[PDB]
């Protein structure tokens, strides 16, 4: 927790949200994308739409959010906001 | 999040080397990564034997290309080394690595890649 | 194929001098180089790719540099847990890969 607290307050003591998340600008953000559908809710045939409820899995990496785990107590994953 | 290797320490001439490595907490079925084999020995340094893309495209060491087979599973999310007619020279430390490929964009050409 | 000749393959030093050691590629491979150091006992860490960049939480006493054919990877200050084997690594646009020869940095006396 302290350790992690120093941690998170390390990461984004000068992060950006705005700008893609890599350490050049023409490296391309690698995205893979996996649907989970977990229920199909309705088939409304007049309007014609379907509902489901889905999780979208998404994965890719931050090149601005790495450290080193021995310098933070061994802490190798965190949750954090999106 | 780490990187496990498990199969036989010893293995007789001429048999089979089979190696897995299995990922914890972590997916094999990941773009941006390959997942490779690299072993050591105290007379050749590093070498790079194969690497596994999660789609199935394999690029192998011209050298060892002929005798490896290197597989997937991604139920385990796991992936293998087979490396056959095996020889006193084989006698190494075998890592499993992870190789990070970045993706960048060239105007008229498309993507091109590092590791 | 590419193939990487790193020298010295010995490079005795003490705490506080600074150290180079050099790779050198048959071909022009761009800056599409890596640097690894290797403690006995344990898997190689990164330390520079792209031949010139810092891998995040490594001590800024590494540098590396170099175009095509000649690299470098020097240490400003050696330090007690910098004694380890270093290694030149060269990628291509696909995953195939050569690793140099190994270069381990010693206690001098």
């Known amino acids: 927790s302290e350790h992690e607290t120093r941690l998170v307050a390390k990461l984004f003591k000068d992060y950006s949200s705005v700008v893609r998340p890599v350490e050049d600008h023409r490296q391309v953000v690698e995205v893979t994308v996996g649907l989970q559908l977990i229920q199909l809710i309705n088939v409304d045939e007049v309007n014609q739409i379907v509902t489901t409820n889905v999780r979208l899995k998404q994965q890719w990496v931050d090149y601005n959010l790495k450290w080193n785990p021995d310098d933070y107590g061994g802490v190798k994953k965190i949750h954090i906001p999106s | 999040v780490q990187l496990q290797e498990s199969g036989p320490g010893l293995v007789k001439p001429s048999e089979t080397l089979s190696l897995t490595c299995t990922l914890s907490?972590?997916?094999?079925?990941?773009?941006?990564?390959?997942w490779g084999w690299v072993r050591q020995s105290p007379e050749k340094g590093l070498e790079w034997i194969a690497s596994?893309?999660?789609?199935?495209?394999?690029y192998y060491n011209p050298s060892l290309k002929s005798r490896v087979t290197i597989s997937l599973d991604k139920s385990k999310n796991q992936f293998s080394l087979r490396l056959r007619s095996v020889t006193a020279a084989d006698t190494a430390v075998y890592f499993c690595?992870?190789?990070?490929?970045?993706?960048?964009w060239g105007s008229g050409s498309g993507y091109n890649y590092r590791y | 194929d590419i193939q990487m000749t790193q020298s010295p393959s010995l490079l005795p030093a003490s705490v506080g001098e600074r150290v180079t050691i050099t790779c050198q590629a048959s071909?022009?491979?761009?800056?599409?180089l890596n640097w690894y150091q290797q403690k006995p006992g344990k898997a190689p860490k990164l330390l520079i790719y792209?031949?010139?960049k810092l891998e995040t939480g490594v001590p800024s006493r590494f540098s590396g540099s170099g175009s095509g054919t000649d690299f470098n990877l020097t240490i400003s200050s050696l330090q007690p847990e910098d004694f380890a084997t270093y290694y030149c690594?060269?990628?291509?646009?696909?995953?195939?890969?050569?690793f140099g020869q190994g270069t381990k940095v010693e206690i001098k006396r």
């Open positions: 690595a992870r190789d990070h490929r970045r993706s960048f």
């Open positions: 907490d972590g997916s094999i079925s990941v773009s941006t990564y390959y």
């Open positions: 596994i893309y999660y789609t199935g495209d394999s």
């Open positions: 071909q022009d491979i761009n800056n599409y």
């Open positions: 792209d031949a010139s």
């Open positions: 690594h060269q990628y291509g646009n696909l995953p195939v890969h050569t």
